Amino acid sequence: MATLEELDAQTLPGDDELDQEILNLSTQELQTRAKLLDKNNRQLPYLVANVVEVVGKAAVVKTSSRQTVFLPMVGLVDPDKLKPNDLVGVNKDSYLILDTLPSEFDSRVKAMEVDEKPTETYSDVGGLDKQIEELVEAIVLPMKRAAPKGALMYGPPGTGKTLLARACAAQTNATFLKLAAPQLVQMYIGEGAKLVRDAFALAKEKAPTIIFIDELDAIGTKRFDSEKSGDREVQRTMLELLNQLDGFSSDDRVKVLAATNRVDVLDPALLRSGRLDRKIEFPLPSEDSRAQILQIHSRKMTTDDDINWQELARSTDEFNGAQLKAVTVEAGMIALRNGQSSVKHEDFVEGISEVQA
Amino acid sequence: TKETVYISSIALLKMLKHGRAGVPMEVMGLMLGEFVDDYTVNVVDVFAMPQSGTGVSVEAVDDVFQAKMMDMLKQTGRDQMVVGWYHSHPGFGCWLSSVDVNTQKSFEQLNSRAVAVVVDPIQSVKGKVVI
Amino acid sequence: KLLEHRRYDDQLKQRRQNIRDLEKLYDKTENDIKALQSIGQLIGEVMKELSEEKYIVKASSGPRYIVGVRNSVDRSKLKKGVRVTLDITTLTIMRILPRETDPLVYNMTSFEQGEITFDGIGGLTEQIRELREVIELPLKNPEKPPKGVLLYGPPGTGKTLLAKAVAATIGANFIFSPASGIVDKYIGESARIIREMFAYAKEHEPCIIFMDEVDAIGGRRFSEGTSADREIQRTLMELLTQMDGFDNLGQTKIIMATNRPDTLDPALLRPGRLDRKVEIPLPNEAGRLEIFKIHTAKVKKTGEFDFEAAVKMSDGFNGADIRNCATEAGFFAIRDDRDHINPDDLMKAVRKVAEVKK
């Protein structure tokens, strides 16, 4: 019964061989692994380049010095990492791509402004809980279940359209992106498109995202006609996002939320599942909707309770929230201008009194 | 001052081959030969250092592989003095590097004297030689 | 006594298995380790062939050069513009290369055939059939070839889908062409972008070309003066010089896109350029109803999901606005806790789809 003992005790050294034999085999390249790669790597930084072919082993790239080179697709790189529009550690002299280079000091377009999923609630600007539901209906509910890629805002901000976005950006916990249409209107052909393209990816990098467009009517113009030479941008940049909207539906990670006082053009694109689905108002909220904001404003002032919001709220009229706060910060200001640390109705009526128009 | 360098065209072409393809890099490695009395720079051989992903340097010299060879070369019966330094200097008449100098300079230490061989493998290919 | 049998195999099994565990990596890395020997290779697209060998290839990275072939070189294939790998030293061909002269998926945008066949957007059926017999068949029925086919009417009625419905059934590669971006401020960039739509596609044929809502680089321009309109007229003429020029559509077909056709060059509207001018109206009530039980009912839905009352509450819904009957109720599906759209989901949607519009 003890034979297979010896027998497989005799296999063991012959067994031991292979691994041990390989442990020899191991080191061998492990060096040349390291050695070259080590030799090889890296410089800070390389010129990067953009692939064309990925036959199956073939790639050409064109440098950050603008130089087209073929190479058999190099070792440190992967065919999926391999791609046009790419950062690559590339031996410049050899035009040998050394490294792939990742998302990196790559342009975020410093001009572009990202607010990642800012924690905000719907108690930011009060009395807007109306479309705060429509938000949830167009954003939260589409997000958390399985749908639009975003909703069309309209209505004057200062009502905190952005806040409700950023509320949704906390609420859905989706990446908020407010990128100024000031950045999107371009002297360069389809650059805002590129900007929308970067923002598309860069925010989708951070998706779930709520992309917050500032006054869509900036790029909300395709005009009517064949004159598009003069402004392609406002059109084409818009057209860029549209096809990026036309590019998904079921992504509720991306929420493209276009804020206007009111949007200009309206396309079944502009209200669409997969494009902006929901045209969403943010008018200057009602009187004690604003007292609700005036609350949020008269909130953090130390006060004597002369305050009566509704009087303020009726005597003030149609404030985008901060005008109440204009009233309010005046009130606080006027509270010391009334000598009080307490901020009172008079402070606020003098917050009214500083001309509210 | 009028000094007699002597090359194995083998080593010459060996370098060339190595150097011709070496573009961009200056090719690097041993230079096998001796000095017969003075003036006399003999070359039987040479060889690539393997690619330097660190490029030509006093550092990128690895004397491991030489010995490996040199052994196998000693095994081959192949043995010489390492007589200096030969690299591929694209579009370079000029001079190679003070580095390369220092590189060599560190190394010609190991001899009475050495070389750093200028090569433009570009300008070499002309049907005449550049070196 | 016999516990060793394990400890034999135990080691062994792993060991004998651990063999190629360690092992495979070497070669792969070794390949890389080797791939590092390999070095990059300069590129050009021949600026021209002086003689069979003699090439002006302006460096794809830089200026013009007098260069020869090298080897594995077809001085035949070698021509002006021919993409070639070039030498760092010999400065000649290191290889001949298949060209991509144009962001075939960006400036050009290429898709093999189309997503859906004709039918799903049925209720657009007028252009379902008639186009195919003027598009797909005359391909397979080369006995004119179709010059162009001009889509117009509201998009995304299936209009958006119609172009690909055309592409799907044919076998061609649908190539989307947006308008404005093709005219860069320069000459022939348009043509360049367009002629690769000619080059790649006619090389890649069968290819559907789709020129998106083009009043920008085409059509009747601004004053038909110079806004860069002359760049636009170029494009307008480029297609003209492709279409009223002898470039045919052999298997590479061109789907024109506009919402309204009359915003375009009448010379384009002529045969030799446009063989077809495609209205694409809304889905009818039944046009919806057909599209409905296609575009909507295919979304997971109850029988309870109210089929025609949606269609009845569906008023002038496009193929997508049909899907909104589904999808706006996909909210209420999601909201009624449905993956399967239910009547409650539904008629909320179709009203919601018919609330904002007709």
Q: What is the 3-class SS of C102-171, one letter each residue?
A: CCCCCCCEEEECCCCCCHHHCCCHHHHHHHHHHCHHHHHCCCCCCCCEEECCCCCCCHHHHHHHHHHHHC
User: How many residues comprise chain C?
Assistant: 358
Q: What region does A7 belong to: left with phi over 0, alpha with psi -120 to 50, or beta?
A: alpha
Q: Does the distance separating the beta carbons of B25 and A36 come in below 8 Å? A: no
Task: Choose among B131, B128, B125, B126: nearest CA to B93.
Answer: B131
Question: How far is CA C342 from each of CA C286, C303, C324, C345, C346, rounded to the nearest angstrom?
Answer: 21, 8, 14, 5, 6
The structure tokens listed for B13 are 């072409």
**Nearest beta carbon to residue A5 from set C2, C29, C60:** C2
SS3 assignment, position A354? coil
Q: Does the distance separating the beta carbons of C88 and B121 come in below 8 Å? A: no
- Is there a cis peptide before residue B24, judged by omega within 30 degrees of 0? yes
DSSP label of B26 = P
Q: Does the distance separating the beta carbons of B60 and A39 come in below 8 Å? A: yes
State the nearest Cα–Cα gap between C89 and chain B, in angstroms. Answer: 6
Q: What is the rounded end-to-end Cα distance, in angstroms, of chain B?
A: 18
Please tell me if residue B25 touches chain A, with a CB cutoff of 8 Å.
yes
Q: Does the distance separating the beta carbons of C90 and B125 come in below 8 Å? A: yes
Mutation target to probe the B interface, by most B beta carbons within 10 A, among A76, A92, A94 is A94
Show the CA angle centred on residue A331, arms to residues A327 and A332, nearest 5°. Answer: 130
Q: Give the other-Cβ count within 10 Å of A85's Cβ.
A: 12
Q: How far apart are CA A345 and CA A331, in angstroms?
A: 8
Q: How far apart are CA C164 and CA C158, in angstroms?
A: 9
State the nearest Cα–Cα gap between B52 and chain A, in angstroms. Answer: 5
State the nearest Cα–Cα gap between B110 and chain A, in angstroms. Answer: 24
Q: How far apart are CA A150 and CA A174, in angstroms?
A: 11
The structure tokens listed for A339 are 């000598």
Q: Which residues contact C108 (CB under 8 A, 6 or more apart)?
A: C102, C175, C176, C177, C193, C196, C197, C200, C201
SS3 assignment, position A152? strand
Cα dihedral sign for C109, C112, C116, C117? positive
Please check if A351 is assigned to a binding site.
Answer: no
Q: How far apart are CA C358 and CA C354, in angstroms?
A: 5
Q: How far apart are CA A316 and CA B59, in angstroms?
A: 78
Cα A29 versus chain centre, distance: 44
Structure method: cryo-EM
What count of CB pairs under 8 Å joins B to C?
13
Breaks (C-N over 2.5 A) in chain A follow: 38, 54, 146
Q: How far apart are CA C155 and CA C258, in angstroms?
A: 9
Task: Choose among A186, A239, A246, A187: nearest CA to C180.
Answer: A239
Contact between C243 and C272 (Cβ < 8 Å): yes
H/E/C letters for each residue in chain C? CCCHHHHHHHHHHHHHHHHHHHHHHHHHHHHHHHHCCCCCEEEEECCEECCCCCEECCECCCCCCEECCCCCCCCCCCCCCCEEEECCCCCCEEEECCCCCCCCCCCCEEEECCCCCCHHHCCCHHHHHHHHHHCHHHHHCCCCCCCCEEECCCCCCCHHHHHHHHHHHHCCEEEEECCHHHCCCCCCHHHHHHHHHHHHHHHHCCEEEEECCCCCCCCCCCCCCCCCHHHHHHHHHHHHHHHCCCCCCCCEEEEEECCCHHHCCHHHHCCCCCCEEECCCCCCHHHHHHHHHHHHCCCCECCCCCHHHHHHHCCCCCHHHHHHHHHHHHHHHHHCCCCCECHHHHHHHHHHHHHCCC
Task: Choose among C299, C290, C284: nearest CA to C329.
Answer: C299
Q: How far apart are CA C339 and CA C299, in angstroms?
A: 8
DSSP label of A273 = B
State the nearest Cα–Cα gap between A76 and chain B, in angstroms. Answer: 13
CA closest to A25 among chain C residues? C23
H/E/C letters for each residue in B56-77? CCCCCCCHHHHHHHHHHHHHHC
**Nearest beta carbon to residue C89 from set B23, B51, B53:** B23
CA closest to C87 among chain B residues? B23
Beta strands at C41-45 and C83-86: parallel, antiparallel or unpaired = antiparallel
Buried/exposed A318-356: b ≥16 CB within 10 Å, e otherwise: ebbbbbbbbbbbbbbbbbeebebebbbbbbbbbbbeeeb
Q: Does the distance separating the beta carbons of C88 and B23 come in below 8 Å? A: yes
Strand partners, C66: C56
Q: Give the other-Cβ count within 10 Å of C258's Cβ.
A: 24
Residue ranges of B 42-81 with Cβ closer than 8 A to chain A: 50-55, 60
Residue C353 corresponds to which amino acid? V
Q: How far apart are CA A59 and CA A70, in angstroms?
A: 6
SS3 assignment, position A212? strand
Q: Does the distance separating the beta carbons of A93 and B53 come in below 8 Å? A: no
DSSP label of A121 = -
Torsion of CA B106, B108, B111, B112, to 10 degrees: -120
Q: What count of Cα atoms within 13 Å lies in the side-chain half-sphere of residue C25? A: 14
Strand partners, B45: B32
Q: Give the other-Cβ count within 10 Å of C176's Cβ.
A: 22
Contact between A156 and A261 (Cβ < 8 Å): yes
Contact between A353 and A316 (Cβ < 8 Å): no
For residue C39, list chain B residues with Cβ-Cβ distance below 8 A: 24
Give phi and psi for A114, each to the nearest 5: -105, 130
Q: How far apart are CA A54 and CA A81, in angstroms?
A: 10
**Nearest beta carbon to residue C36 from set A75, A137, A146:** A75
DSSP label of A356 = -
Task: Choose among A214, A219, A202: nearest CA to A254.
Answer: A202
When computed from its CA atoms, the radius of gyration of chain A, rounded to whole angstroms, is 30
Residue C45 corresponds to which amino acid? E
Give phi and psi for A175, each to the nearest 5: -55, 120
Q: How far apart are CA A59 and CA A151, in angstroms?
A: 41
Q: Which residues contact A140 (CB under 8 A, 6 or more apart)?
A: A168, A171, A172
CA closest to C1 among chain A residues? A2
Which subunits count as partners of chain B given 3+ CB pairs below 8 Å? A, C
Please tell me what resolution, in angstroms, this structure has.
4.8
Helix ranges (H only) for A216-320 are 233-245, 287-299, 309-315
Cα C317 versus chain centre, distance: 26
**Nearest beta carbon to residue C216 from set A32, A142, A228:** A228
User: How many residues comprise chain B?
Assistant: 131
The structure tokens listed for B36 are 């017969």
Contact between A212 and A255 (Cβ < 8 Å): no
Contact between C169 and C119 (Cβ < 8 Å): no
DSSP label of A247 = T
Contact between A141 and C333 (Cβ < 8 Å): no
Mutation target to probe the C interface, by most C beta carbons within 10 A, among B16, B52, B122, B130 is B122
Helix axis angle, A321-337 to A345-353, nearest 10° = 110
Question: How far is CA A245 from each of CA A195, A233, A331, rounded to the nearest angstrom?
Answer: 15, 17, 45
Contact between A86 and A50 (Cβ < 8 Å): yes
Task: Choose among B59, B110, B121: nearest CA to B87.
Answer: B121
Question: How far is CA A354 from each of CA A7, A300, A329, rounded to the nearest angstrom?
Answer: 102, 20, 11
Q: How far apart are CA C121 and CA C128, in angstroms?
A: 8
Burial of residue C66 (number of CB atoms within 10 Å: 0-12, 13-18, 19+): exposed
Domains in chain B: boundaries: 2-131
Cα dihedral sign for A56, A57, A58, A64? positive
Question: How far is CA A63 from each of CA A278, C93, C143, rounded to the nearest angstrom?
Answer: 44, 19, 49
Contact between B83 and B115 (Cβ < 8 Å): yes
Helices H / strands E in chain B, number of each: 4, 6
Q: How far apart are CA C53 and CA C49, in angstroms?
A: 7
Cα C134 versus chain centre, distance: 21
Helix ranges (H only) for B4-62 are 9-22
Q: What is the rounded end-to-end Cα distance, in angstroms, of chain C?
A: 89
Q: How far apart are CA A274 and CA A147, in angstroms?
A: 7
Task: Choose among C99, C88, C84, C91: nearest CA to C68.
Answer: C91
Q: Which residues contact A331 (CB under 8 A, 6 or more apart)?
A: A298, A301, A343, A344, A347, A348, A350, A351
For residue C16, list chain A residues with Cβ-Cβ distance below 8 A: 15, 18
SS3 assignment, position A151? strand
Task: Choose among C221, C249, C248: nearest CA to C234.
Answer: C221
Contact between A124 and A67 (Cβ < 8 Å): no
Cα C308 versus chain centre, distance: 35
SS3 assignment, position A318? coil
Question: How far is CA C339 from each of CA A68, C64, C109, C311, C336, rounded to the nearest angstrom?
Answer: 51, 62, 34, 20, 9
Q: How far apart are CA B26 and CA B19, in angstroms?
A: 7
Residues in chain B whose Cβ is within 8 Å of chain C: 20, 23-24, 51, 53, 90, 121-122, 125
Task: Choose among A227, A31, A195: nearest CA to A108.
Answer: A195
DSSP label of A185 = S
Q: Give the other-Cβ count within 10 Å of C329's Cβ.
A: 32
Helices H / strands E in chain A, number of each: 11, 11
Contact between C28 and C58 (Cβ < 8 Å): no
State the nearest Cα–Cα gap between B99 and chain C, in angstroms. Answer: 24
Q: How far apart are CA A113 and CA A244, in angstroms?
A: 19
State the nearest Cα–Cα gap between B53 and chain A, in angstroms. Answer: 3
Q: Does the distance separating the beta carbons of A94 and B24 come in below 8 Å? A: yes
What count of CB pairs under 8 Å joins A to C?
219
Q: Give the other-Cβ count within 10 Å of B76's Cβ.
A: 11
Give phi and psi for A219, each to the nearest 5: -90, 10
The structure tokens listed for A342 are 């307490």
Q: How far apart are CA A194 and CA C189, in angstroms?
A: 18
Q: How far apart are CA A215 and CA A234, in angstroms?
A: 12
